[PDB]
Design a protein around this ligand. Structure first.
Ligand SMILES: Cc1cc2nc3c(=O)[nH]c(=O)nc-3n(C[C@H](O)[C@H](O)[C@H](O)COP(=O)(O)OP(=O)(O)OC[C@H]3O[C@@H](n4cnc5c(N)ncnc54)[C@H](O)[C@@H]3O)c2cc1C
Length: 398
């Protein structure tokens, strides 16, 4: 009975387990799933939980509810060390041995060595960061309303990055901010929402026509964009940016970083050839020198056969990688060879509030209500693909 140890119960990790548990026999292998929290959270919905347009409990479900418990041991613990050669994983709740390992430990914020960006800004990482940020935003409207002398800077919000995560967040803020203005007695004209992006283009994965749609939607709803503008620091007051190479202080009571992510810090400590918590895997999703270790999700850099650059970090690729790993573990267990991973680009949608969005679905571009609808299908399909129709019914977007 070989030991299959899965690290992380995210999109990649939990998908590997819920597929594998259907395939193997109790005599074939023993599965162990280690996760920090008792729940699985929908990281792709953290823009809503962070803005406060959704209750945090709606973006998560208990891990054990989708497990076949005669085949999987759920361990709630934090992975502290991974010994690739000794075949051991240390946690705050004990050491666990392995025959096969699946590293699916996800991502964390990456601030590109920008001084004060982790300390003085709120990140978009998990349910705990989301809860802290939505409460902070509302507390700023509440404290503003409470003060006799009103500082309109308490209501100024800075968002670092105009990519997928940045735009999704701005979209939720445009639904939330009017509601808080009305509740706390504030005029919307006093609220300032500024998106700063160092790159020369916003949402670089989409057409100019789709980006023009996103920009017009957010600009009409009070967002100002400062693109191709580097963020050289973050302090108590807000961000320090360069404009024509001249440092300028931008003030804001809330500074949110959404411009970069990296794989788990455990990656550099545990494996060789790691660049910002990502490891370039072999085509079957194993790592160089270890036919018994798989690294998937945001901890991986899968370069497709014909190409040179790795595919981007997404929950879509993560889930597809987990389905691959589950089949290849069964093949390994039965003395068979592994098959290569082939990513199927079904397209995606960046939300723009509750009733809008920009995306590519079936290879054709989509916007507005059709995008909002398809975003609910993609989000509900991801609950379905891990836990089935009942969980999709209970926790989906329909
Ligand atoms: C707001 C937002 C919107 C996004 N929208 C999209 C979208 O529309 N489509 C899309 O495809 N992608 C989207 N993404 C990207 C997507 O969320 C990630 O690529 C995805 O989360 C990667 O899944 P994963 O399994 O690798 O990691 P994760 O989702 O990060 O899960 C890792 C799990 O491991 C646990 N863990 C981490 N470290 C430890 C440790 N040391 N010990 C134990 N447990 C640990 C975590 O608690 C978590 O349960 C978005 C991301 C964000 C933040």
């Amino acid at each position: 009975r070989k030991k299959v140890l899965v690290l992380g119960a995210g999109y990649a990790g939990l998908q590997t387990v819920t597929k594998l548990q259907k395939a193997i026999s109790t005599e074939e292998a023993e599965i162990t799933l280690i996760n920090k929290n008792e729940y699985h959270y929908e990281a792709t919905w953290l823009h809503e939980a962070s803005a406060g347009t959704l209750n945090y409990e709606d973006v998560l479900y208990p891990v054990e509810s989708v497990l076949k418990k005669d085949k999987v041991n759920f361990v709630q613990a934090e992975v502290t060390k991974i010994d690739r050669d000794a075949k051991k994983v240390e946690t705050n709740q004990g050491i666990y041995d392995f025959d096969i390992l699946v590293v699916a430990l996800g991502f964390v914020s990456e601030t590109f060595g920008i001084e004060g960006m982790k300390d003085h800004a709120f990140q978009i990482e998990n349910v705990i960061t989301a809860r802290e940020l939505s409460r902070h935003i509302e507390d700023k409207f509440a404290n503003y309303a409470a003060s006799k002398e009103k500082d309109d800077n308490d209501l100024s919000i800075l968002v670092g990055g105009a990519g997928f995560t940045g735009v999704s967040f701005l979209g939720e803020l445009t639904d939330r901010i009017p509601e808080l203005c009305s509740k706390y007695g504030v005029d919307q004209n006093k609220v300032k929402i500024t998106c700063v992006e160092a790159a020369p283009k916003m949402l670089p994965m989409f057409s100019e026509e789709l980006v023009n749609h996103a920009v017009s939607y957010l600009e009409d709803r009070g967002v100002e964009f400062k693109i191709a503008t580097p963020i050289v620091a973050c302090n108590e007051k807000g961000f320090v940016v360069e404009v024509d190479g001249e440092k300028q202080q931008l003030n804001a009571g809330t500074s949110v970083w959404a411009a970069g992510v990296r794989g788990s810090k455990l990656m550099e400590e545990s494996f060789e050839g790691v660049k910002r918590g990502r490891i370039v895997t072999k085509q079957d999703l194993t790592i160089n020198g270890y036919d018994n270790i798989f690294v998937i999700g945001d901890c991986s850099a899968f370069i497709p056969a014909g190409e040179e650059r790795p595919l981007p970090t997404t929950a879509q690729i993560a889930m597809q990688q987990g389905e691959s790993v589950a089949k290849n573990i069964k093949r390994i267990l039965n003395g068979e060879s592994t098959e290569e991973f082939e990513y199927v680009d079904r397209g995606t949608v960046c939300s723009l509030g509750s009733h809008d969005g920009v995306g590519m679905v079936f290879g054709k571009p989509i916007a507005g209500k059709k995008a909002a609808f398809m975003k609910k299908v993609i989000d509900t399909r991801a609950v379905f693909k891990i836990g089935g129709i009942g969980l999709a019914f209970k926790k989906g977007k329909f």
